[PDB]
Design a protein around this ligand. Sequence first.
Ligand code: CLA
Ligand code: CLA
Ligand code: CLA
Ligand code: CLA
Ligand SMILES: C=Cc1c(C)c2cc3nc(c4c5[nH]c(cc6nc(cc1[nH]2)C(C)=C6CC)c(C)c5C(=O)[C@@H]4C(=O)OC)[C@@H](CCC(=O)OC/C=C(\C)CCC[C@H](C)CCC[C@H](C)CCCC(C)C)[C@@H]3C
Ligand SMILES: CC1=C(/C=C/C(C)=C/C=C/C(C)=C/C=C/C=C(C)/C=C/C=C(C)/C=C/C2=C(C)CCCC2(C)C)C(C)(C)CCC1
Ligand SMILES: CC1=C(/C=C/C(C)=C/C=C/C(C)=C/C=C/C=C(C)/C=C/C=C(C)/C=C/C2=C(C)CCCC2(C)C)C(C)(C)CCC1
Ligand SMILES: CC1=C(/C=C/C(C)=C/C=C/C(C)=C/C=C/C=C(C)/C=C/C=C(C)/C=C/C2=C(C)CCCC2(C)C)C(C)(C)CCC1
Ligand SMILES: [Cl-]
Ligand SMILES: [Cl-]
Ligand SMILES: [Fe+2]
Lengths: 341, 334, 137, 81, 442, 34, 36
Amino acid sequence: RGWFDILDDWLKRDRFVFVGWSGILLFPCAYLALGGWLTGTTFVTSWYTHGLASSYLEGCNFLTVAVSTPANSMGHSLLLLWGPEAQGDFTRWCQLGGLWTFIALHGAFGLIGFMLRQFEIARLVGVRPYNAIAFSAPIAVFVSVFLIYPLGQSSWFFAPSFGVAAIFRFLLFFQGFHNWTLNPFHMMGVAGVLGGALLCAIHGATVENTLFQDGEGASTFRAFNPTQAEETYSMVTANRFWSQIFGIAFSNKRWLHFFMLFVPVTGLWMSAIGVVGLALNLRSYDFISQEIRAAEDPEFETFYTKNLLLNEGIRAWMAPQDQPHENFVFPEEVLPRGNAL
Amino acid sequence: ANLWERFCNWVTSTDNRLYVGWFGVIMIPTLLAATICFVIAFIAAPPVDIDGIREPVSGSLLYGNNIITGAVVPSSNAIGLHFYPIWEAASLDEWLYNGGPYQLIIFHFLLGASCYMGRQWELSYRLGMRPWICVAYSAPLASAFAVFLIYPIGQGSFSDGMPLGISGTFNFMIVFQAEHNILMHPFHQLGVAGVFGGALFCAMHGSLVTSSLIRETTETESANYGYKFGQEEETYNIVAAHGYFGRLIFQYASFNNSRSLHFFLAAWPVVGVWFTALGISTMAFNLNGFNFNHSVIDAKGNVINTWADIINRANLGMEVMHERNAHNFPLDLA
Amino acid sequence: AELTPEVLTVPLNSEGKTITLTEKQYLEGKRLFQYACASCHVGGITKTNPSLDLRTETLALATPPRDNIEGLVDYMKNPTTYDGEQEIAEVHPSLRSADIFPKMRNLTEKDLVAIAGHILVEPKILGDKWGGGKVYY
Amino acid sequence: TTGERPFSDIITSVRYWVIHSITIPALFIAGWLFVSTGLAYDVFGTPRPDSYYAQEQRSIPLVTDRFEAKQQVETFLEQLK
Amino acid sequence: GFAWWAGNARLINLSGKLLGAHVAHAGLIVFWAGAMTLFELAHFIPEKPMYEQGLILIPHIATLGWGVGPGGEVVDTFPFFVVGVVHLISSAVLGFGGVYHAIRGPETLEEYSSFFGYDWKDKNKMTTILGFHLIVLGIGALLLVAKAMFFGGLYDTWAPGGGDVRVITNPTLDPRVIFGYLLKSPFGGEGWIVSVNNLEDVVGGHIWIGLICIAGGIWHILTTPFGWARRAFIWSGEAYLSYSLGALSMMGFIATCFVWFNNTVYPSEFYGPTGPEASQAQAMTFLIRDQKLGANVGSAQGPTGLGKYLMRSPTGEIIFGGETMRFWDFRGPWLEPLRGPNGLDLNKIKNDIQPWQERRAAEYMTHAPLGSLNSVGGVATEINSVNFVSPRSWLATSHFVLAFFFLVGHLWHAGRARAAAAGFEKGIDRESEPVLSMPSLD
Amino acid sequence: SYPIFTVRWVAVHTLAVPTIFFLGAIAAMQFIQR
Amino acid sequence: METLKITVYIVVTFFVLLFVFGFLSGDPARNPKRKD
Ligand code: CLA
Ligand code: CLA
Ligand code: CLA
Ligand code: CLA
Ligand SMILES: C=Cc1c(C)c2cc3nc(c4c5[nH]c(cc6nc(cc1[nH]2)C(C)=C6CC)c(C)c5C(=O)[C@@H]4C(=O)OC)[C@@H](CCC(=O)OC/C=C(\C)CCC[C@H](C)CCC[C@H](C)CCCC(C)C)[C@@H]3C
Ligand SMILES: CC1=C(/C=C/C(C)=C/C=C/C(C)=C/C=C/C=C(C)/C=C/C=C(C)/C=C/C2=C(C)CCCC2(C)C)C(C)(C)CCC1
Ligand SMILES: CC1=C(/C=C/C(C)=C/C=C/C(C)=C/C=C/C=C(C)/C=C/C=C(C)/C=C/C2=C(C)CCCC2(C)C)C(C)(C)CCC1
Ligand SMILES: CC1=C(/C=C/C(C)=C/C=C/C(C)=C/C=C/C=C(C)/C=C/C=C(C)/C=C/C2=C(C)CCCC2(C)C)C(C)(C)CCC1
Ligand SMILES: [Cl-]
Ligand SMILES: [Cl-]
Ligand SMILES: [Fe+2]
């Protein structure tokens, strides 16, 4: 009955919000990441890091507001409040982009905390820890995109800024500079996310339309009982229906629900791998066969070459405002443009 | 015993390995026409003058494409929204140049896909099921109508419906962004929310059921063998799943009613994707995403850029480069 | 930076006399300019003849010079081609043609000055953007 | 079911609204003042509409040194005084 | 059986309360027509085109010939006011009948009067109600014919002189014209019924539809459904709602294409130019500009080798070049003077373009139906300045959405109707699962 | 016989107290003018 | 081409009529529960 156990006792009490040992890491870090984002989006500028306005205070709306990344000149500085850049000055710290690192790092440690929470509760309750395992997928994405990617580049500046439209810009950057749509690891992620949404919708609909009649009312929700032993819908009729509409169907409820975990988890993991390649500018940018033929044959044209022209438009038209530290000056006459436009 | 009656019984028979049905009577020939023409065109169609400027784009494998770059190319801008069946061409050589195969394939597919949805209603009736699976499927179906029919109708040309290929898809979505700012459109944002949320809830539901499977097996065998097809008892403990997830968040944000839970699974990505289909369908009539270009200015009136303005620099690069020989006047109005 | 009298100060005429607009007049002219003009002249370009813009240096080389309140107010009454050679009231909105261009009907004389003032002030604020087109968006 | 007091029972309770019909406007007002007093600008370093540029300036005051960065924005800020 | 969120299904067999719901909802419809009109009028400025002003109801009234004169000049705003007031006042009476019948009046009607009472499964009674409404609809379409021919006429964008209100003296009656539209292809250059381009055909069709609806309304009062109909349909209140949902959905998609393409019953003077119109107009504008400078637009080879200003359609007609080659089916009153039999005529182009045509083209070009959801006009890359989204976009997009969900609603209610009719809408009977009594597929 | 102050009490106020404050600050902001 | 056109009109018409008459043939009654 030492103090350690007394604390364990208290941390693991059944209450409206379970705390647990993982609570000690989760709750401060989750609350700080989230408070930093609301604080910066309400009050803090990106004028000195990006030449952008980015808070409600400056005139931005929910779509355009963001906690932006530090200036390229910070490199990968941890940008600690007490560090050599801001030197304890809260105000300067904000102005130099210190809230980005605050949010990214407290967020990483909250994610760990949350995954430890899934592990802690699963152990206390007596269930298998497959929900913690599935949550590895979000983690991979977050670390690869917000940490590994800009660590392979010149600075945090080129990580995603925390904002709706800042993220849209990140999407478009990756098309023009990395040709990310062409990347087979992104395509595998696409198929996992879309395949996940499909599975989600097809499994819910199927259950709802093979229900057993277990009550008299037109509202069928009332006729389930959390503790009934009986399946509430017919796997058998569900299986014949899909075998006859689609050719194949699930027959194993256990396989089905594992497949539902497997598909979206795997796809997110594949896309994380691809982003690690782009950390290094290791892109699937080109097909060498196409380029050789196109250079020699001015009549040969594909959707592959058309999209590279668009990427070239993107880079030159957005680079100078998007990378202000580079002092890109592109006089009118060097901008790629088609006819009239 | 009558001849028509025996035909009708075979069409609607619940004993064919694949259900036919009256919707099937139209679906099968049209999906076969679309599929066969697709396969041949993808492998072997010669280049197609999509933009009507006598600048043919090669889409097939034998004309120097791979699986990722290939496509059935949309039909010529010279045709616009005109119906261009084979018998309207002076020859197959003309029909191939102007992109006839695209029309054939899309019209047959959209018909056959529409009957696919009907077929889903129909078999549900023959089997004594509830009927609304087909409603779930209307979301993807709607999405296909938008990129192959509604957007072409609003923009005046099938040259601007989505190519039938991997890289052509990307072309279509880049040009859309340049012209409509789809990322800044709320209905597209609800599509992402429906798709991200769908993948999330897919993973959640699959991991919760999987976590609460009842021990029915040994370490040396797939747990999947703990469920036998058609057993009457449930194969997991939902109260255990509820008890874990309720504590993970808090009790009242977790489902203990499996019917509510499975209806929620159905509605979230269906509705999200209706909205995103509606996004393409309304941007087809050029009601575009929010425009905050130069919305922030200072006391003097300098423009103070935001992320919206950076997005606009990117959209501009797409704009000025797409279909680089096809514009003779300063505004790309369709 | 702010909207100071030195920026709100623009040529009245070609003699070289000046007038200092009020903030009011400036914003009055901006609004009136969006109402009657921006459909073709958003950002100081001319959507229907992009070869002619509202930059000060272009207006300065128009015949008669239009880089001043007098020239611009006059143009709004009796528009001409750039070389002054033909009157184009039939195809350009003007008080002279307010019967076919109905938006010009409720424009008073001081509205014209606010509009001419806006046109001359905005380049001092926005620089190359004014009349530069999408390259500078 | 865990022994805290039910939410529905607190927010219909007269004692609850006696406190929170003060505490909620006081907080809303306090937030107001933080902005209307100008304090939020000074705390966070956020430019006022009149202080993004110097009058004739069109250069962004972009930080370009890591360890001199603090000194840079202070220099850019007195180039407005 | 039903929960609160499906609580209106509790009215299926309460004819009197369900009457109140319908009449009260009809009151909401009339209310909005009234209030919305008064709003638009209150905000209306006559010197500005209607389409710069976010107006959708004034243009429908103008189109009936009220308040406008030649060219669409608004000459009298009082018809607008009247239309708004009378609608708004009428909604109180319908509101009144609605609340009464939903709250106080008899829950069920079939006891009060044997006339107003109905049972969904009474095929005779149902076809009789249908016939009454068919006659009403038929009367209504004749009202429009009466306006056109005997009470001031309609606005005619095609009238010589820039457009004008015009009485329709010779409505088209030839059924080869009228029904010919119904058999034209919906594809480009044809356009099914959306391609109607003259008020004589508009008025003539409404004569026919009026007679057809009255005839069929009398038919359905006099008959009961034949057996082939009895056996092919489901006869229930939800079934009938599903049939109407399908029909409203189809109608909504048609209306979408009507307001997007048709510039006759949606005159461009009021609604703004169509997408094709604005696109043709830009090519006209630069043809005009370049020719004044001395360009020979006929002989000018653009980059691709196609004409920079003029080219041929796939059937040879001379048309506008650039991307607008897709819109060569466009026909508008500002453009038709330049057309000969081979299409655009090069000698009229060189010689006979008028200022009013130059003006119309500049205006329509700069009012193309492109704009952001927050009403910034122009292409998605344009800067703020011009507050504008075309009425045609607002009307097209809204009715595509509504049409779509009504189609979803048709599938929802049709499939439920079928399942309820067969007795398995609440789920599968465990003791009699149909699949468990079928042979296995393999 | 319920407690007034709990872990629950705290988590709620941890969020709701700055939420209102922030809504006040943002409300004022709609009235800022350049 | 004209022969192709006839053939398709014929093929399409045929399938569309199978569809129309198939559902006219008492489709409500082809379910596993209640037949009428
Ligand atoms: C003529 C039109 C019509 C009619 C009369 C009915 C009638 C009915 N429907 Mg159907 N339905 C329709 C159209 C129609 N529907 C359409 C178009 C769809 C597709 C979306 C559906 C989809 C549908 C479903 C899925 C279901 C019904 C059901 C029902 C029944 C109960 C409905 C109820 O109580 O709603 C109560 C009303 C509400 C719960 C409020 C809904 C509010 C909507 C979702 C929000 C819209 C927001 C608005 C656009 C913008 C917000 C602005 C903001 C400021 C407020 C009833 C018989 C139920 C049924 O089958 O019963 C037999 C049922 O389950 N309907
Ligand atoms: C167009 C919208 C519409 C209409 C016309 C109706 C109409 C009706 N509903 Mg439905 N309902 C609707 C929308 C609508 N509902 C929506 C959106 C929902 C989702 C929340 C529901 C959910 C719902 C449920 C759950 C139930 C109904 C029921 C009913 C009926 C009985 C209600 C009753 O007795 O009220 C009693 C209410 C009052 C006495 C309160 C006052 C209401 C009045 C009408 C307010 C009017 C104020 C107005 C300004 C006055 C102008 C007066 C002037 C013209 C003289 C009635 C016919 C009930 C039913 O079927 O009963 C059998 C029922 O159980 N409805
Ligand atoms: C189409 C909608 C509709 C329908 C089917 C009914 C049906 C019914 N109502 Mg209801 N009612 C309605 C609308 C409707 N009413 C409206 C809009 C109001 C408000 C004015 C009322 C107010 C009302 C009251 C106060 C009462 C009823 C009663 C009745 C019942 C007896 C009717 C009778 O004998 O009338 C006798 C018939 C006549 C006197 C002939 C009237 C001729 C009408 C007014 C002219 C019709 C012209 C045209 C259709 C209107 C369009 C004009 C406009 C577009 C400008 C019957 C079931 C009574 C009832 O149920 O008691 C239990 C009752 O007390 N109704
Ligand atoms: C609101 C409108 C309406 C409604 C709902 C009904 C409903 C009905 N009618 Mg009535 N009818 C109406 C108006 C209406 N009618 C009018 C105005 C007339 C006068 C011309 C008639 C004349 C009439 C007759 C003569 C008969 C009916 C019959 C029937 C019943 C069978 C309907 C059926 O099977 O159709 C299904 C339709 C078909 C099986 C064939 C349709 C084929 C066409 C070509 C489809 C084309 C669709 C296409 C996509 C759109 C383009 C149109 C095309 C022409 C270009 C049903 C109760 C029958 C009955 O039992 O009456 C006692 C009957 O014999 N109706
Ligand atoms: C953008 C999409 C997206 C979001 C928003 C999201 C969100 C979430 N997923 C969770 C869970 C999950 N996600 C899962 C699978 C997936 N999740 C996906 C995509 C997402 N998942 C996908 C596609 C999948 C499929 C594999 C699973 C399987 C789970 C869970 O088990 C769990 C859950 O319970 O779901 C119900 C929750 C974790 C809560 C938490 O950590 O609290 C603690 C909060 C912390 C630690 C703070 C993190 C701070 C972040 C990382 C940085 C700062 C962010 C800013 C505040 C906001 C910036 C916003 C701008 C960018 C616009 C949370 C609601
Ligand atoms: C950073 C930092 C910190 C902290 C901080 C914090 C922690 C904060 C918090 C904050 C917060 C905590 C905030 C909040 C706010 C909120 C908000 C601002 C909200 C909003 C909302 C809204 C607006 C909503 C609305 C709506 C909508 C929109 C839709 C739907 C419905 C609703 C109603 C929901 C410290 C000190 C450590 C220091 C360092 C730095
Ligand atoms: C049943 C029910 C319901 C419904 C309701 C309804 C829908 C109602 C209706 C109602 C209505 C529908 C109403 C109406 C009203 C109106 C009125 C009452 C009007 C009046 C007006 C006036 C008075 C006018 C005046 C004027 C003039 C004369 C001139 C100009 C100006 C003015 C405007 C001033 C609900 C959902 C709620 C719920 C449940 C039950
Ligand atoms: C006014 C007008 C006009 C005229 C119009 C007309 C004359 C119309 C007609 C219309 C019509 C006359 C329509 C028709 C309709 C029909 C329908 C739409 C049908 C439907 C059907 C169905 C839906 C069926 C179903 C089924 C089947 C198929 C099988 C068995 C089962 C059942 C029965 C379900 C015009 C253009 C000149 C111009 C402008 C104005
Ligand atoms: Cl392109
Ligand atoms: Cl062009
Ligand atoms: Fe499940």
